[PDB]
Amino acid sequence: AITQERKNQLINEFKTHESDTGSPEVQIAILTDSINNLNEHLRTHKKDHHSRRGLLKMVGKRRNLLTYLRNKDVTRYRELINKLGLRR
RNA sequence: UUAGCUAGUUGGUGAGGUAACGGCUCACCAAGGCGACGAUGCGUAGCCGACCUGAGAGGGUGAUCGGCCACACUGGGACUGA
RNA sequence: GCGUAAAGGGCUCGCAGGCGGUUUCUUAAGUCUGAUGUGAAAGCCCCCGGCUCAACCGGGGAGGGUCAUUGGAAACUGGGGAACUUGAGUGCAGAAGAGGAGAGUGGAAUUCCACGUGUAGCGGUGAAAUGCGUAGAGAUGUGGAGGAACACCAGUGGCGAAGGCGACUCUCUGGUCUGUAACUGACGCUGAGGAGCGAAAGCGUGGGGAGCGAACAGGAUUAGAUACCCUGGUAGUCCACGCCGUAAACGAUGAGUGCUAAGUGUUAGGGGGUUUCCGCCCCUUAGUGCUGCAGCUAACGCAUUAAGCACUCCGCCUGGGGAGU
RNA sequence: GCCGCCGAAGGUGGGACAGAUGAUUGGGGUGAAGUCGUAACAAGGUAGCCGUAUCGGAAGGUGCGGCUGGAUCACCUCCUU
RNA sequence: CUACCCAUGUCCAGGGUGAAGUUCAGGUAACACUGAAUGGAGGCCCGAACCCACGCACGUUGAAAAGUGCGGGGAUGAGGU
RNA sequence: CGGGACCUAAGCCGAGGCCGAAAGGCGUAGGCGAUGGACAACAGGUUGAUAUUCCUGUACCACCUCCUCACCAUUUGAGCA
RNA sequence: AAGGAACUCGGCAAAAUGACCCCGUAACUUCGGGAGAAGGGGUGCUCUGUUAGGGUGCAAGCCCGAGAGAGCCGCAGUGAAUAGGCCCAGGCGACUGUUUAGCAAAAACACAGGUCUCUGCGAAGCCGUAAGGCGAAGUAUAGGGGCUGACGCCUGCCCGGU
RNA sequence: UCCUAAGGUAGCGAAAUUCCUUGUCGGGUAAGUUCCGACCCGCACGAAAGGCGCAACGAUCUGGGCACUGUCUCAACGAGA
Numbered sequence: 001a002i003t004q005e006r007k008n009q010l011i012n013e014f015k016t017h018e019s020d021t022g023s024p025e026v027q028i029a030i031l032t033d034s035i036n037n038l039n040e041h042l043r044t045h046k047k048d049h050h051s052r053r054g055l056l057k058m059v060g061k062r063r064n065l066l067t068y069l070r071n072k073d074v075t076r077y078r079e080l081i082n083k084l085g086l087r088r
Numbered sequence: 089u090u091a092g093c094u095a096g097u098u099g100g101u102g103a104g105g106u107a108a109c110g111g112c113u114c115a116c117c118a119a120g121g122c123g124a125c126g127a128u129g130c131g132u133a134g135c136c137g138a139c140c141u142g143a144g145a146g147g148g149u150g151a152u153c154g155g156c157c158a159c160a161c162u163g164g165g166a167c168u169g170a
Numbered sequence: 171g172c173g174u175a176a177a178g179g180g181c182u183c184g185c186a187g188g189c190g191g192u193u194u195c196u197u198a199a200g201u202c203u204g205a206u207g208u209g210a211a212a213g214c215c216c217c218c219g220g221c222u223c224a225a226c227c228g229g230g231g232a233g234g235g236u237c238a239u240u241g242g243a244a245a246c247u248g249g250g251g252a253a254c255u256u257g258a259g260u261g262c263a264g265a266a267g268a269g270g271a272g273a274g275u276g277g278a279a280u281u282c283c284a285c286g287u288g289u290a291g292c293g294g295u296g297a298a299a300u301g302c303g304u305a306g307a308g309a310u311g312u313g314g315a316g317g318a319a320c321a322c323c324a325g326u327g328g329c330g331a332a333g334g335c336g337a338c339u340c341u342c343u344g345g346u347c348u349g350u351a352a353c354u355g356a357c358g359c360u361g362a363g364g365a366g367c368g369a370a371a372g373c374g375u376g377g378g379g380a381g382c383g384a385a386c387a388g389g390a391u392u393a394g395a396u397a398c399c400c401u402g403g404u405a406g407u408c409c410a411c412g413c414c415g416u417a418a419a420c421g422a423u424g425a426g427u428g429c430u431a432a433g434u435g436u437u438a439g440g441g442g443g444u445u446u447c448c449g450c451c452c453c454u455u456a457g458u459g460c461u462g463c464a465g466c467u468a469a470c471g472c473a474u475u476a477a478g479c480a481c482u483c484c485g486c487c488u489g490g491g492g493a494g495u
Numbered sequence: 496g497c498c499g500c501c502g503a504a505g506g507u508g509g510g511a512c513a514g515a516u517g518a519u520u521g522g523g524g525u526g527a528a529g530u531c532g533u534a535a536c537a538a539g540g541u542a543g544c545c546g547u548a549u550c551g552g553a554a555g556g557u558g559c560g561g562c563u564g565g566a567u568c569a570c571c572u573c574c575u576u
Numbered sequence: 577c578u579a580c581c582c583a584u585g586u587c588c589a590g591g592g593u594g595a596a597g598u599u600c601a602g603g604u605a606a607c608a609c610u611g612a613a614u615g616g617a618g619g620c621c622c623g624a625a626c627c628c629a630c631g632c633a634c635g636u637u638g639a640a641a642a643g644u645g646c647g648g649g650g651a652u653g654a655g656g657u
Numbered sequence: 658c659g660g661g662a663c664c665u666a667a668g669c670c671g672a673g674g675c676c677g678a679a680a681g682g683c684g685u686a687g688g689c690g691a692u693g694g695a696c697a698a699c700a701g702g703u704u705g706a707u708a709u710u711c712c713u714g715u716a717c718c719a720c721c722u723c724c725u726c727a728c729c730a731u732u733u734g735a736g737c738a
Numbered sequence: 739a740a741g742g743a744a745c746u747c748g749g750c751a752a753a754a755u756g757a758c759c760c761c762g763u764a765a766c767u768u769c770g771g772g773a774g775a776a777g778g779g780g781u782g783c784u785c786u787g788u789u790a791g792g793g794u795g796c797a798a799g800c801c802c803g804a805g806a807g808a809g810c811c812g813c814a815g816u817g818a819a820u821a822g823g824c825c826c827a828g829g830c831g832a833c834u835g836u837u838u839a840g841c842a843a844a845a846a847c848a849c850a851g852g853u854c855u856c857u858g859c860g861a862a863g864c865c866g867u868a869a870g871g872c873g874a875a876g877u878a879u880a881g882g883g884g885c886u887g888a889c890g891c892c893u894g895c896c897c898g899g900u
Numbered sequence: 901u902c903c904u905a906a907g908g909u910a911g912c913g914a915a916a917u918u919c920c921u922u923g924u925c926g927g928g929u930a931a932g933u934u935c936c937g938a939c940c941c942g943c944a945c946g947a948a949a950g951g952c953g954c955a956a957c958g959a960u961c962u963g964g965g966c967a968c969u970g971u972c973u974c975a976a977c978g979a980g981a
Contacts, residue, residue: 021261022354030260039606041342049367050270053331054344056183056366059605065259068357086605
C-alpha cells in the first residue's frame with residue numbers, strides 16, 4: 001500500500017494541526033498502517049527477503065518515532081499509543 | 089576455556105542474645121535478592137606509609153623502621169578479667 | 171596503527187551503551203576557584219646546623235587526595251522550561267531501474283524418439299585411438315516429448331545492505347534520487363551482545379533429470395600418467411520444503427558528517443538562454459568512470475567516490491613456525 | 496551427678512576439579528645423507544590463489560563458484576596528445 | 577485339541593510417569609520464544625485377577641501320557657477369552 | 658424368564674442360471690443360521706422336591722367383541738394405510 | 739557360632755532388597771530418559787487435640803486430616819503377611835511381541851524404516867480342469883514378489899561367466 | 901613382473917570369524933587357558949547373504965565389585981510328610 005483513501009483518509013482522520021501534513025503522530029499513523037499492510041503482504045509469500053528487510057526497517061522506524069513521541073509529550077503519547085492499538 | 093548464584097538466602101513480624109543495630113540466632117509469614125557497572129567459581133596474594141626504576145605518565149616489590157589485620161604444633165571451645 | 175607489511179567485522183537491523191544542530195531563562199550535577207578539617211611519624215625534594223668532611227643524624231620547611239564540610243563564577247557538558255530550522259522525517263509532484271515474491275506464456279539451440287532421403291564413413295586430435303556406423307550412421311526433411319538457459323538490445327549501463335539480479339506478461343511489495351517547498355521541530359549518528367540475510371560446494375526428504383559434469387570406465391601423450399587431451403559416465407546443477415552461515419564474501423579500504431585545484435566522460439532528474447520545433451550552452455543535483463593540484467605515504471599509489479584535512483562510534487592488529495592445530 | 500540443644504575430629508556415600516603415570520597411537524618439531532616424485536615462484540611446463548566436495552603414495556588432480564594478487568594478446572572502454 | 581481367518585460379545589483390581597493440545601502471564605512488529613496452570617496419549621512404569629512357561633526343587637511303574645511348590649515375564653494391547 | 662409362531666451377521670443351503678467325462682464346483686432371487694437388534698412381572702409365602710410359574714396382592718402385553726358409551730363421515734370418504 | 743564365594747563350568751541355590759513421605763541422584767543420550775539411578779533420614783503410642791485446613795450438613799453432627807511441640811516405653815516402631823537387590827564393563831539384537839504344544843523363548847522370527855522389481859486394472863500374482871472369487875466396492879503416494887532390518891555415518895571395485 | 905572382467909576401498913580385526921594359540925603387551929588378581937584394552941600373522945573380516953558405532957529394552961550370553969548368606973571350611977540341631 002498504502003491506498004490514497006488511507007493516505008489522505010488516514011491523514012484526514014488523524015490530522016494533529018489543521019494543515020499539518022507531518023506532526024509525528026501523523027507519521028506514526030501512516031507508517032504504522034503501511035507497516036501492518038506490508039506485514040500481511042509480506043506474510044502472504046514468506047520467502048521474499050527484500051520486502052522483509054523493508055518490513056524490518058519500516059517497523060523499526062515506526063518504533064523510533066513512537067519513542068520520540070513518547071519523549072515529546074507523555075499523556076498525548078499514551079493517548080496516541082492506546083488509540084492506535086500497537087506498541088502493546 | 090567460570091552465567092549462573094543464593095533458601096537464614098531476600099524481606100517482614102515476634103522472641104532471645106551481646107557493649108550494640110542487625111537473620112546475629114530461632115518461631116511464624118512472604119518469594120525474594122545478586123549479576124555484563126562481572127555475581128559466583130578457580131587462581132594468587134597480608135594491605136598501607138613507602139622502596140626501586142622512568143623525563144613524566146606509568147611498571148615492579150611490600151625486606152629492614154613504623155600503622156593496621158591475621159596466626160601462635162593442627163583443629164574447636166570457653167573461664168579469669170575492664 | 172588497519173589498500174598491499176599483522177589488522178576492516180561478509181552484510182544489515184536494532185536494545186543497552188558512547189556522541190550530538192542554533193537562540194534564550196534557571197541550575198551547579200560535572201568544570202574552575204577561595205576558607206576550614208584531614209592526608210601521623212620516618213622517607214623523596216628545598217633551607218640550615220651537629221659527628222675532622224661524607225655516609226649519617228637532627229631541626230626548619232615543602233609536595234602528595236574524582237577526600238570531606240563550605241563560599242563563589244555559569245563560559246562549556248548535562249538537568250529543566252521556552253523557542254527556531256538546514257539536520258532528519260511526513261506531505262505534494264516527477265523520474266527511473268535485471269531490487270524481491272508468487273502464477274502464467276513465449277521462442278532460438280542441444281539431446282532423444284517416429285518416419286521419409288541417402289551411403290560408408292561420422293567423430294575427435296598436437297598426431298592418433300577408444301566410441302558410433304551396412305541392425306542404415308553423419309548429413310537432410312517433417313513431426314512429437316522433456317529439461318535447462320534466455321543471443322540480439324548489452325555498455326569500466328541500471329538497481330540492491332551485500333551475496334547478487336537479464337526472454338515476456340500480470341498480482342503483491344520494498345527502496346532510491348529530483349523538484350518546489352505545506353507540516354514536525356533534533357524526533358539524529360554509530361552501536362558490543364541479540365535478531366536477520368548471505369555465491370558455490372555440500373546435508374535431509376520428495377519431485378525433475380535435455381545440456382554440462384567430481385568420483386568411475388576406456389583410449390591416448392610420458393620412463394611413469396591415480397593428471398593435462400579425447401570418447402563416454404554417477405552424484406550434482408533444476409524445483410519446493412528445512413539445515414548448513416564459509417570464499418580473493420575485494421575497492422584486500424567499517425559507518426556517519428563538514429571542508430579542500432581543476433578537466434573529461436555516463437546515465438537518472440531539475441532551473442535557464444534564445445529556441446513551436448529540434449539542437450546547443452550554462453547553472454544545478456544525485457549516481458558512477460577516467461585524468462590530475464594541494465595534501466598523505468615506506469614506495470606503488472589515493473586524491474571531493476581520499477588512503478587529504480578534523481570530529482562520533484564499532485570491530486580488528488602486537489614477529490614467524492608451532493597453529494586456526 | 497543425670498538429661499536436652501548445637502558442636503570439632505572421624506566414618507560412610509555419590510559427585511566435581513586439578514596434577515602425576517599408563518600398553519599403544521595422532522599430528523608436529525629437529526637432524527643424520529636417506530628412498531619416491533617436481534606441486535609452487537617465468538604463461539614454473541595446465542596461470543595461480545580462496546571457499547567447498549570427492550579422488551589419489553604425496554606434493555596434489557578434477558568439478559563448482561569467486562578474485563587478479565594474470566604472462567599475454569585482441570575486442571574494448573576512453574586516457575595524454 | 578491346536579495354526580490361521582471371519583462375524584459378534586465379553587474381560588482387564590489399584591496407583592504412578594507425564595507429552596501433544598489448550599488457557600494464563602511474559603515476550604516480538606506479527607511471529608518466534610519462554611515460564612506457570614490446565615491437560616491425559618502411550619505396543620509407557622509398577623503390580624493383582626488372567627495368560628504365558630525362563631530358573632530351581634519335586635515328581636518320574638507320578639496326585640498327573642507334561643503337573644505341583646517357591647520364585648519369574650506380559651498385564652490397554654501385535655492383548656486374554 | 659431362555660428359545661420358536663420376529664429380523665439379520667461371517668457362513669451354509671439354494672428354483673432357475675454358469676462351468677466340468679460322470680459324481681459335482683459356484684452362484685442370482687430366496688431362505689436358514691445368535692454370540693447381536695427388538696421384546697409385556699413383580700414382592701412375599703410355600704414343600705420331604707418346583708418358582709421373577711403354584712398361591713396371595715397388584716400389574717403389564719397383544720388379539721377379538723355376544724356388551725356399553727364417546728367422536729367422525731357416507732366415496733364432494735371416516736379410516737386402514 | 740567364626741569366616742563369608744574359598745564350593746561350583748557358573749553366586750545354581752538359598753540368604754538379601756523392598757510400603758509411603760522427604761532429601762538427594764552421576765557418566766551417557768535419540769534430549770523423552772537413564773532414574774524406584776546411586777546413597778540416605780523419618781514412621782509405634784499419649785497429650786496439645788471435637789488440632790491447621792478441607793468434604794458434608796441449618797446447627798447438632800459426623801467423616802478426611804497434614805504439620806508440628808512436649809512425653810512414653812521397648813533390642814526392634816511399614817515390629818506380623820505380601821510388596822524391587824544393586825553397580826561397573828563387554829559381545830548380539832533397536833525396542834514391546836512371536837516360535838519349536840510335550841527338552842531348545844534365544845543372538846532365531848516378526849517389526850517400522852531402507853531398498854530392487856513387476857503390475858494401467860477382464861491386472862501383477864493367486865486357488866481353481868474350468869465357472870467363480872481373493873487382489874478390491876483398492877487403482878502406481880496402490881497392490882504382489884525379493885533382499886536387508888530402528889537411529890547415525892555410509893553402501894568401495896568387476897557385466898568375463900550365469 | 902604373470903593373469904583376470906576386477907584384484908577388497910572405508911570401517912572393523914587373535915571377534916559367535918584365529919587352526920599354530922594360552923599369538924605379543926598392558927589393565928583387572930596374590931594367582932586370570934575366560935574377561936577389558938590395543939598392536940595385525942585377516943589360516944579362512946568387510947559393506948544391504950550389510951560394515952561400523954549406538955542412549956532405551958532383553959526371563960539372552962560373559963567378566964568384575966558392594967551388601968548378604970549353609971553354596972563350603974565342617975557340619976549340627978529342630979518341625980511336619
